[PDB]
Amino acid sequence: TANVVVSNPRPIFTESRSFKAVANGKIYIGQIDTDPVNPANQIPVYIENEDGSHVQITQPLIINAAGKIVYNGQLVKIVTVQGHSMAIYDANGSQVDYIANVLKYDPDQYSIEADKKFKY
């Protein structure tokens, strides 16, 4: 029976008017409906490693030349704690995009979620 659908989980960041990736841009995520570049408005982020170490990193996220997120040159998965406002800046520093409210739950760790939720 159908239990798991194979899909690409690595996000891709591209420009807003052209089908080209954001070559080494910077992402800031902060409190919703605010200016993410403000350190006071920024919220914590965590790399979710292959085991779930959940290691906290600095706020400005560097984009790959392929539009993906990297840290120390390695592709990483990045999660946060709540809904957020995301501002994406190009390589030169020009504002590529700004979204006030976005919230996509992690489709992962359902075993842990079920253990937390369902009673025995």
């Binding site: 807003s16 008017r17 052209s18 089908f19 020009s94």
Partner: protein
């Protein structure tokens, strides 16, 4: 180069015109972009008169692959400015606009530069007429009985 698609050429032309760019707060419609791409294709086909006009390396998109925008134009690095300046000049009337003097002059200069190399190559001199003798100073031809030029 940062202009690698027909839509990129159209965006550059619109930015030159002042209608839409990456900094404006109002953008043009995808239908308008598609119309501009149709203009660019029509103008390029008019220029490249089935291989006997302005040779530029432009690649004409096919209907099988659906979107014309997203295809590499194939122009050399020195043709992009001329192409999108002429395109801006041509699509200016769409928005009740008029291309400025600098844009018009740059379009003329770019078109001339585009045709310069092809004109130099095409400035070829015709062979000798069929009734010209080869002269007796051409010893081997005279001996081997090629006394007149072939022509054609």
């Amino acid at each position: 180069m940062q202009i690698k698609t027909k839509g990129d050429l159209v965006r550059a032309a619109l930015r030159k015109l002042g209608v839409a760019s990456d900094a404006t707060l109002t953008d043009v419609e995808p239908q308008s972009m598609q119309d501009a791409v149709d203009d660019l294709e029509a103008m390029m086909a008019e220029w490249y008169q089935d291989g006997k006009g302005i040779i530029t390396g432009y690649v004409f998109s096919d209907d099988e692959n659906p979107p014309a925008e997203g295809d590499d134009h194939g122009l050399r690095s020195s043709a992009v400015s001329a192409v999108f300046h002429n395109l801006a000049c041509r699509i200016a009337p769409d928005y009740a606009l008029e291309a400025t003097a600098k844009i018009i002059a740059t379009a003329k200069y770019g078109k001339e530069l585009l045709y310069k190399q092809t004109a130099i190559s095409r400035a070829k001199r015709a062979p000798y007429p069929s009734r010209m003798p080869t002269g007796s100073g051409n010893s081997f031809a005279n001996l081997n009985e090629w006394h007149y030029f072939p022509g054609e």
